[PDB]
Amino acid sequence: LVVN
Amino acid sequence: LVVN
Amino acid sequence: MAVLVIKLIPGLSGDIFRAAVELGYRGIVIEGYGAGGIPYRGSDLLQTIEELSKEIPIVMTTQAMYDGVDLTRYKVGRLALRAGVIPAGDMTKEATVTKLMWILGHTNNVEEIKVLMRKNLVGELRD
Amino acid sequence: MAVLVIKLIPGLSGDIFRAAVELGYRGIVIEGYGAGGIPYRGSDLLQTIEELSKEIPIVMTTQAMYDGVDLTRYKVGRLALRAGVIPAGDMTKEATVTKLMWILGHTNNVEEIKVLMRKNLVGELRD
Amino acid sequence: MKILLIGMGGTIASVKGENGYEASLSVKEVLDIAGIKDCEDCDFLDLKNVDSTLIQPEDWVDLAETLYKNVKKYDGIIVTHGTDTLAYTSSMISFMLRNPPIPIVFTGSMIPATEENSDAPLNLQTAIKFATSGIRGVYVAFNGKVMLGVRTSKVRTMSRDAFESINYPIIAELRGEDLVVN
Amino acid sequence: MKILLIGMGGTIASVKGENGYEASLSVKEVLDIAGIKDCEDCDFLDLKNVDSTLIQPEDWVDLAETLYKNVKKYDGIIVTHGTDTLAYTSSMISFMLRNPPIPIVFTGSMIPATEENSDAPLNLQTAIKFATSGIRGVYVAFNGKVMLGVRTSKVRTMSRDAFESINYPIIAELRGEDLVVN
Ligand SMILES: [Cl-]
Ligand SMILES: [Cl-]
Ligand SMILES: [Cl-]
Ligand SMILES: [Cl-]
């Protein structure tokens, strides 16, 4: 959150 | 050994 | 010869791991929270380790005193394995680091270091 | 905000601590062997820390689970204090690091951080 | 009397699917599956649903804000959480909320509530009893024991007895139906 | 029968002077001050006299070489050492000397042998009994317990019970005058  |  | 041991804490970046490698460290131990795993949520750490674990052995232990790691237990753990992290199984922290240092005195082949770290050499590890 | 936790192992150099500072880390925790102390024999670590502890807080905990640190107990410990190291007393590792991070959110004055770290804020520390 | 339960996710709320995907249950669902029938006048709030290894400092700010907004409305608060960073979260919250007017109790479980022989019902029941004690502060309840949140460490990776109070007495310990001081 | 004691220094060998200077005793002097009378046919060799916090990897190479030169001449070897890095030294030596033909026992004490109520006599007596057991390997003897050297960690900074065997059974434990298996 954020993951990529 | 060696210390300074 | 030179190993660096870093404790995983919330918000830890991959930048120190890259600095370590540039300094010439030949191995890294990451002391994780429990059974193991590397943060990827709002963290560049998993991405960094995935990149570096091809260059040098990156070993995972746990901050907990007992039961050791198992990267197969949880999803975050399984991700760490895929990223190329070497689990320390049930080894003590002292055995993990001295074992790595000892191996590094013989080889620098990461895949070779990997199989040695997972092999019970003298009673330190359940393999 | 950014803290780095490094475990003391035989042969650890000061070079990673300098790299940490250059990267912008605002605090360092060094997890020592027992009651506390920084190697100076065939090691540049004490010299390095003596230099850096004026710039950022450098806190000492212990790898041992119980009883915490006491830098007054042994000669190597007393040297660490003179070098400007902040003891963590009997705090848990988790409390030590979160406390430091919390303080760093308020100040960057090392002497101020020093007195806060030694003060029992919420029951984490015997002061 | 009046208790809020806040969900953060963790093993306690885990369900496993046909393939390698896990998913997280809401905190009310966890409590219902755990078989807690004694929790009426309990509100439920889901804040996060993450494995605690993924916990980041931003999450502590969110939790602290939510806690601050609710301390005056409830008599006790319980936060369910993954075990990996439970002691980090409980420690940071202790520093952020210096004078909580109520018990704030962190808990979780090593075995999902949806699994056989879960530790979830014991820990939730322990947390609920302490949440009604009138003892102000930030605590961790696990394996029948209540520990000061800022004196707790995870000690085992593969056991129900996952935590200990470090250099400090256990606050209380469940015996029968009673929490017994120390 | 035939035992070598190798000194590395540490708290066990510490004497304190009028001012803040400490100094280290030789291993034979330690054993004599500890009151060990049962150790005849014991040789003594002083390798280092350092606080174990100062231990460096070079020291392990020196120790390993000295051990290698003496394993065939003695029936058991005891190494006295500071507690801070005892488990590191005992672990690295285990990797360097993979098949020792004799018991090699690491020990030390939290209270100097020259002080009142020292743990030194217990640990030396434990080490000596194990050194005569005929059980090959690298071990650590402390607070009446013998642990595999590569499974030992320092667990307390301010107690006589400073070490534990981690995820592995204790090798033996002194009861009365007997080392009892586990
Ligand atoms: Cl280096
Ligand atoms: Cl950074
Ligand atoms: Cl209230
Ligand atoms: Cl022999």
Numbering used by the authors:
A (entry chain D), B (entry chain D): 4841 to 4844
C (entry chain B), D (entry chain B): 200 to 326
E (entry chain A), F (entry chain A): 1 to 182
Sentences reproduced from the published study:
Variable temperature solution light scattering and/or SAXS experiments have provided important findings about influence of temperature on protein shape or association levels which expand our understanding. SAXS and crystal diffraction data analysis brought forth that despite lacking a 19-residue long linker which connects the two domains, namely the N- and C-halves (N-PfA and C-PfA, respectively), cPfA adopts a solution shape and crystalline state that is comparable to wild type full-length protein PfA with improved specific-activity. In conclusion, the findings reported here provide structural evidence in support of temperature induced higher order oligomer formation conferring stability to thermophilic proteins thereby regulating their functioning.
The interactions of P2 with dcPfA forced us to speculate that either this might be non-specific binding or probably another site involved in establishing contact between protein molecules. We thus attempted co-crystallization of cPfA with peptide to further investigate this observation. All these interactions were located in a single zone between adjacent protein molecules.
